[PDB]
Amino acid sequence: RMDCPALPPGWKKEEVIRKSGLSAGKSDVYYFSPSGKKFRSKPQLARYLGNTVDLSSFDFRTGK
Amino acid sequence: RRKVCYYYDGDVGNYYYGQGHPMKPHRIRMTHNLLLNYGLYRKMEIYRPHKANAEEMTKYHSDDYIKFLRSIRPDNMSEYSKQMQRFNVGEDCPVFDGLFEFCQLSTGGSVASAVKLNKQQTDIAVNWAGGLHHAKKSEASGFCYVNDIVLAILELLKYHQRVLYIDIDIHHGDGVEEAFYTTDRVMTVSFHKYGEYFPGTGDLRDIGAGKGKYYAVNYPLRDGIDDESYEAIFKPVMSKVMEMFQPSAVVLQCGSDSLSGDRLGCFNLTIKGHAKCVEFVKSFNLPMLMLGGGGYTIRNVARCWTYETAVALDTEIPNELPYNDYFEYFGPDFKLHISPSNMTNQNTNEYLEKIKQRLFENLRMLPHA
Amino acid sequence: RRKVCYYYDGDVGNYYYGQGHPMKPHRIRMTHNLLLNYGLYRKMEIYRPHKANAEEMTKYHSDDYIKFLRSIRPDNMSEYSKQMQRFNVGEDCPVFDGLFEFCQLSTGGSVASAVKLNKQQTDIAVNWAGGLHHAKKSEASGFCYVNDIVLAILELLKYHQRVLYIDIDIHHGDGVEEAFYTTDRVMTVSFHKYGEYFPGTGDLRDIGAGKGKYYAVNYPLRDGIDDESYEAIFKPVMSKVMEMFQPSAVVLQCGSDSLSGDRLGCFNLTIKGHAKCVEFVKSFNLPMLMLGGGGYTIRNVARCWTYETAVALDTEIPNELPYNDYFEYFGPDFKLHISPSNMTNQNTNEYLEKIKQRLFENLRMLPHA
Amino acid sequence: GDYVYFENSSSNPYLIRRIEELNKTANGNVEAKVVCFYRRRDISHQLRHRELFLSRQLESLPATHIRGKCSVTLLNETESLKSYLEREDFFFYSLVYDPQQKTLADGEIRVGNRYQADITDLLKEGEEDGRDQSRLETQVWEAHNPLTDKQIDQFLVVARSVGTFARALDSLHMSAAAASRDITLFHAMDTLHKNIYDISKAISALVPQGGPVLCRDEMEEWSASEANLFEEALEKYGKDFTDIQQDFLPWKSLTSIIEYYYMWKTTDRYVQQK
Amino acid sequence: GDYVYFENSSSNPYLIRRIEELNKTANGNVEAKVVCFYRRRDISHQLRHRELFLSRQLESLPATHIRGKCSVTLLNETESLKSYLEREDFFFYSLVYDPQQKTLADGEIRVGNRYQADITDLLKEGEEDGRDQSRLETQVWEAHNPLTDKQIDQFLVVARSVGTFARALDSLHMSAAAASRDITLFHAMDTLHKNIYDISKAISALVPQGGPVLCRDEMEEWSASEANLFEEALEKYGKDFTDIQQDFLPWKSLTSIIEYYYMWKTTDRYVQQK
Ligand SMILES: O=P(O)(O)O[C@H]1[C@H](OP(=O)(O)O)[C@@H](OP(=O)(O)O)[C@H](OP(=O)(O)O)[C@@H](OP(=O)(O)O)[C@H]1OP(=O)(O)O
Ligand SMILES: O=P(O)(O)O[C@H]1[C@H](OP(=O)(O)O)[C@@H](OP(=O)(O)O)[C@H](OP(=O)(O)O)[C@@H](OP(=O)(O)O)[C@H]1OP(=O)(O)O
Ligand SMILES: [K+]
Ligand SMILES: [K+]
Ligand SMILES: [K+]
Ligand SMILES: [K+]
Ligand SMILES: [Zn+2]
Ligand SMILES: [Zn+2]
């Protein structure tokens, strides 16, 4: 769980490698709120944050 | 044959913008390394640039913008977020470890070289790290944090009445433009894509203001421009520019995202065509300061600036890439040159001649005899 | 500190006397190689000796003895057998491929060096290949085909009135003795085993003849002589010799079969003792020409002449043998020095003093003031 | 091939169409087959007032629907139209629009003290810039050397040989390649310059006290197990190099991990491509 | 302990003996136990007239056999005897002779024109020896060089490194050791001297055109199969190197086979000792 400096304080990003199946070796990216709530996509994260951040130019995968 | 000074700090390839980010400083290290193995390194004066301190960065920028940069880290990233938004540091300009170190090297290279040019102890000076032209006085923009170009130019003005700034980068050089928008001592010429593209500025009607009116030249362009079309509109315009603006020092930003198959760019230029511009400029035998800039298919960025360095030394190099630490990066081919794509050039002759003429009028407004 | 000239031809180690034969030229190559790795090579003037031609070998030998040698091969070995018997080439002096080449190198080294001494452009000159002292005018003997020593001495007589010849080899130096038996210009001193031993000559009563009477000194010895006994009888006699014979050039044959544990020899000398003689001679500061000679436990032959070369350069070397191509030859120890054996010294003080006195009388017969 | 103004049944501006075929039936009624020109709104500003898009929508309607004839020009011909010849009848097209899919061929500059730079005044012929050049640069290779290409080349071979012999003293081809990498070469070009381009002096530098020198880049320098760690951290965290350190290689400095990364991307055993 | 002259029954000179024990029997008859002194003939010239050897032969004979007493002195005491005191009675010994075994403590020089050398006359102060020194020698190392031990040492390391890098271009430790053998070093000391002890010039010699130089002794140079041939020829013909060539390695020159032999005797895989 890495701090994501471009999100507000306490937000973290984690990348997880798939271990088996059709997409073995590909990864999934997750974000965690300061309380530890887990988010799995850009629109889910944007819905949660609302107007407190502008995510138009935010690259969900890299966190930049 | 002109004397060339090359500025490089080994650390510059190792600073990293962030996962998924297109700007990759490593491309300068790739160039550096080719230059050594193409035997060009040998042939020019190689300088390590000391770090530029806040002292000389504030010669243009805010005392509290640089202060912010000197201070900010990924540690205190959630503490500063207030100031982060006021200064544009985020979505496409990340914070990252070493950021301020990176700026110091890019700026040090350009400034040191400017001095070198003023001190009249070189003809050409090259700093591929530099060229970061979207930066503003009080905010970062388009991957640029410090505008090394402005600072460089500001030093040159100490010995040069008129400084010409040429910008090949596919993106409009609005940082260098805005910084000198109201002065007649510096003329900013820029050839770039326009229309649903960054930075949204630099159309035909962007001419300057005040004393700086008729001193900001722009050439807006659509997708798919050839070497042939580009050459046929660069030489005419620049010869007029020299004719009219009569400068005593040139600063050529050699942005490599105007090449074909760039990740962000959508022009169809080859290294050959791209370089023909550097060669044409060099021909006007003025103190010259080559900087880099954009470029996001780094294999080609490497190729380009390696080639364009040869051009400053007017030495030939083979298409055969020499072995190097990153040799394996260069496709199945391992060649220096790239060829243009089947991509369609939407810059019809009619559209280029309309613009050309409008610019020729603008340039005629300057004083002459 | 004296200047030393060292003569060596790489080929000399590679000539071979024959299966089961004790004389092994390879021991010179072993020395050569140690000298390089002990750093001594560095410190002296190194010369390759050109081949001595029949021209200068016949300056002492028969025009038809050398002719025979130039001609003989293992091919025409059954054709010549007539002449083979007249010239002693067989049982313990084999014919072998390159034989005449071997002689030319051994003789070239000694002659070149003699010249070098006469030309007064060295103080010491060293040729380990040389020293082959059993050869006669018209026949080979005791592994010696050409008597390089005589030829060497003959050149020295061109500039030196009196030439002293000292012979440490365990075998009596009858070749050099017989060649100069009737002259007063060259004095031949020799310390050797006697009694059921080769060459059967050189007892107490072997004094010379004619003008050469009282000019051939000999010291006959039994088995097992120490460094201590040898030193105590060499220095006294040689100081008298210098005192009386007052020479102007010395030629020291440094036969290494007088060392302990030799294959053919039966003396109990150490490298240290053996060398003490070379050092004592050198001390008399005369143009000096060190040659080798016998030696048949080649590991020690190598050691000896390596050490004795150091002595001519009066530089120290460690007992630790330096690595070299033949490093593995030198036992489990890999040391330079050897120690004496439990072997019993049958040279009682009474027997050595009897002889000593007889020689002191002989030497007194020379002219002096 | 002519362009026409059809009835707009809502009262609104006329619909524009290109005539593909003009047909008359047996009862003398005239009908026309027509390709639609779409208005920018209807295509469901850089769009001019008179923009029209050539669609793939084809319709057939009676000739009574035609109220007028028009010109839909190329973009160049519209822009060339003179002010007097400007009319209600003139329109233009530059885009083909697929009506079914929606498919289509394929920001301000500021003035003020807080935007422009203060322009640095030209120095007097007596005034001096006051800039300490040692605080700005330190030279690493002079281009005008008493040496020739051959000699430099030769020295580079020597610098490589030492390096191989160095790593022989604690795989032959491997060590030679290792010693032939750029770091060793760069170090060879500095050794020259530091020693004032004296070959004989520079070679001492390479063998200081009879002992050779080793230059190893992060690629070669890392342990087997560090290399291993890296391939686990990458395959698990992708290219997130701060977390790759924090969790996998925390004893290494970020910037060494970067340098390693790029060098590792050329690895032989590395095959992400097919 | 006295020495006596016994009857010689043949008429010849008296036999000499040392008295070990004098015995008288019950009937007053006197017998003596005596160690024999052997005459030089009987010991079956450096032997003097009066040499006698102390034997391990012991006999017993009656006292009537004694005809006289004598002195058998040490060698030193015999030689010290004065001319007047010289007698028939004085003899000497210096050797113990085993009579049973035959054991005993533990060739001509010629004169004439065909033996002696003609002595070369001393040259006049005006006369010159007339000897061309280039026909006699060619120098291979000057001992007074502008170079220091360190620099020569250093050069030797470099000469070794090139060599290793040379054989890397068509086992690391093996190639380095190979390049560290004497042949390479000797070649390094000549390269110096040929180039007038100019380090910078000499290094070019080692890398003529960017390419290094290889020196391989017969040990390293022979093929695997030649090496093999040699170990068959030796184990079969012993150290008979002309036949070893004729029958096993006839394409090699005898003198290369010799040089190889000696180098091979130090081989590791070579263990004739235990
Ligand atoms: O290592 P990074 O700096 O993140 O860049 C890599 C790299 O691009 P470069 O080689 O031009 O640096 C990959 O190229 P290869 O390693 O495959 O040669 C590329 O993969 P593709 O060239 O196949 O696109 C990949 O892109 P992606 O992440 O989309 O796979 C991209 O990473 P970024 O996209 O994060 O820059
Ligand atoms: O190779 P060669 O010139 O014929 O000499 C060898 C050699 O003696 P050196 O090493 O002194 O030259 C042997 O020694 P190693 O190879 O065993 O070390 C020795 O064997 P010993 O030392 O065990 O006697 C052997 O002697 P031999 O043939 O009696 O076994 C002897 O050969 P030559 O006797 O023919 O000289
Ligand atoms: K531009
Ligand atoms: K301007
Ligand atoms: K002797
Ligand atoms: K004599
Ligand atoms: Zn750009
Ligand atoms: Zn001998």
Author numbering:
A (entry chain C): 149 to 212
B (entry chain B), C (entry chain E): 8 to 376
D (entry chain A), E (entry chain D): 9 to 52, 101 to 160, 162 to 163, 165 to 228, 237 to 340
Verbatim from the authors:
The Nucleosome Remodelling and Deacetylase (NuRD) complex is a multi-protein chromatin modifying machine that plays an essential role in cell lineage commitment and DNA damage repair. The complex controls expression of genes through two distinct activities: removal of acetyl groups from chromatin through the action of a histone deacetylase enzyme and remodelling of nucleosomes through an ATP-dependent helicase. The deacetylase module from the NuRD complex contains three protein domains that control the recruitment of chromatin to the deacetylase enzyme, HDAC1/2.
To understand the relationship between the BAH domain and the HDAC catalytic site, we prepared a complex containing an extended construct of MTA1 including the BAH, ELM2, SANT and GATA zinc finger (ZnF) domains (residues 1–453) together with HDAC1 and MBD2. CryoEM data were collected and a map was calculated to 4.5 Å based on 94 041 particles. This part of the map has a distinctive, relatively narrow volume suggesting a compact but elongated domain which fits well with the known architecture of BAH domains. As would be expected, the position of the modelled BAH domain is such that the carboxy-terminus is close to the amino-terminal residue of the ELM2 domain. Importantly, we were also able to fit the BAH domains of MTA1 into the cryoEM map - even though this part of the map is comparatively less-well defined, likely due to some local motion of the BAH domains. Strikingly, the nucleosome would be positioned on the ‘top’ of the structure which would bring the histone tails into close proximity to the HDAC active site.
